[PDB]
Amino acid sequence: VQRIYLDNNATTRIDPKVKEIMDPFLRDHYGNPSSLHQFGTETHPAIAEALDKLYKGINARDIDDVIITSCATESNNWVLKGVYFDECLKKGKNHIVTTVAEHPAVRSTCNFLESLGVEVTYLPINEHGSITAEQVREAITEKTALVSVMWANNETGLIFPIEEIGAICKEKGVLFHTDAVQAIGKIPVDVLKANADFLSFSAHKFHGPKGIGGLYIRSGVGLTPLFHGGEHMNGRRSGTLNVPYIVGMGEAMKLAVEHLDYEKEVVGKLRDKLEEALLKIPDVMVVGDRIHRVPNTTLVSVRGIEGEAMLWDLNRSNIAASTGSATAIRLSLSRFNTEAEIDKTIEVFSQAAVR
Template identity: 60%
Template sequence: MEVYLDNNATTKVDPEVFKAMEPFFCHIYGNPNSLHKFGAGTHPKMVEALNYLYEGINAADADDIIITANATESINTVIKGIWIDKILNGNKNHIITSEVEHPAVTATCRFLESQGVNVTYLPVDENGTLDASLIKEHIKEETALVSIMWANNETGKIFPIKEIGAICKEAGVAFHTDATQAIGKIRVDVQACNVNYLSFSAHKFHGPKGVGGTYVQKGFELTPLLHGGEQMGGHRAGTVDVASMVGMGLAMKLATSEIALAYEENHVKKLRDKLENAILEIPETIVIGGKENRTPNTTLISFRGVEGESMLWDMNQKTIGASTGSACASEDLEANPVMNAFGSDSELAHTGVRFSLSRFNTEEEIDYAITVIKNAVNRLRNISSSYAYTPKDHVSQL
């Protein structure tokens, strides 16, 4: 049996989405910017896709959603656009973010630091929770942007976006959120949360890879990251991948429906909890960040005495896919920076394994995964030269 439990890295394309994309490869293939009927034939489905994107995050009609290649491009579009508009060409020189952001945010902020920008990285507590009041404490006259993720890609922890949005609005500071791991798992509402910029990627909610979006609230325009043609109203040059845009729109519609979100909260969460509770029966296993306030599909578990990469190897031999954290950092064998930020000791920071489910997982798959995981932990601890189980040290979660 093959069991895919790495849905925070990427998801399978929903068959209904794939079917909707097919005509745009060989039948409706015109360049949407061409004036002839072959190009114009793409327009109705592109408009429909944009409407689905607007509805999925509750954007207003006057707002913009720019189609990009992925969330990484979307994040760079916002942060570097703010750098150009508010820092290079303005009187601002400060950005606020957190210590547990996706590398697309962190690496972009590090680049801006090399250009003289001041960046504040706010800490989280041992449960991975960010205190929204820290935002208010660190905002100053020079602050150009606050960028805080909606949900963490490794633990699933949900951040207080509504509170942060209110604080930023009161202070007159632009607010960006990376919603890549939130859309399709929990309700995302940019109007209710006073979000000015939002980034997302289709392949995280059963759409195709290679396409994403940047939400820009009316009145918060940005200098484009890519210059060239007048596509996307001049906000992002380059011929639009119509098939992917159509696929992303339908994937958004399917993933953000009331039925889909209820299924995540009930069925997917039930399977996640079954997997998690069975793993916690193993001595000295820990849910990093605890069980509260998470997306329904994600758990990051530490197996004391077992390297995360060793666990992945054993599970892979039994055709189970999981990860040790962000797929964008999967080749980096340094201690997990998110676990470090949570205050995990140096040993535990190498032992985390992330399991992330989707609506396509079944109970039969979870039962099989539980058996494989328990056998793998037992085998790896038995051959370890350093692990020794001390019952009094066993805890079930932080």
């Protein structure tokens, strides 16, 4: 059989080169990098090369940190709770601004901070499916400890005005964090242009393994560790390093940035072919703006039949997609989809819809 995977904003396939580069550290190179003997220092060159790939992947400077975490959820929890202790409890800046579109790892943590007494304003989305940047400014009081706005939304693919939010935060002296998970491998990511203090990402959204992530911390910026222990990652995140996943995630970031032109010109062309073909049937409307989007995502809405039925049908024909709040059908492509797959999805989608 031949199945079609169109659920890449939920997770992606590991690139074969990533698995290949991870294998030796699952085999004979199992030393703890903190060890002083040869099994430990034996791992240091590959770890350094992987970290270098990450730094260059997000345009991080040598003075900055790219701390290895276990997923984007850890990065987001670490940002929000760290600034809760450093900037909210100790500096009296008991206010955080974020958006209603943020991943549950951000919104649920913000709810937890609210339970402790922190004041959090979740900026409402507009009809364009985006946040303006004027909204954060309206909400940035002199007690805002942190602004947290995701770079690209996982349900609609919509790109938020990261850069202008960073400029507002820079002029107003408030820390800026961006959840950039959906942006890696989709659009160019530059922490300097974003003026980001914190940036989150997760490997399994750009063809690395599930269970490893990264938090960019700007030079000089403090953040009380979420993982105390003080051994690893310059004492900022303790725990024995996941060497294979570090190497693999480095390679995945490298491949992801190397495929940016292909992502916009080819994957985006497949998404536009799919979307244009799919809107030529009854009343199926795309949910959100069609310009400020990452190249791989389309979110289509169909009459009065729920999206879950359409997805159950698609899955019966071995086509995997997800839902999306509008419910609508989220189809998210990748580097490994082909035009034949897209034509097939147009046919199976139409036949399933009329049925």
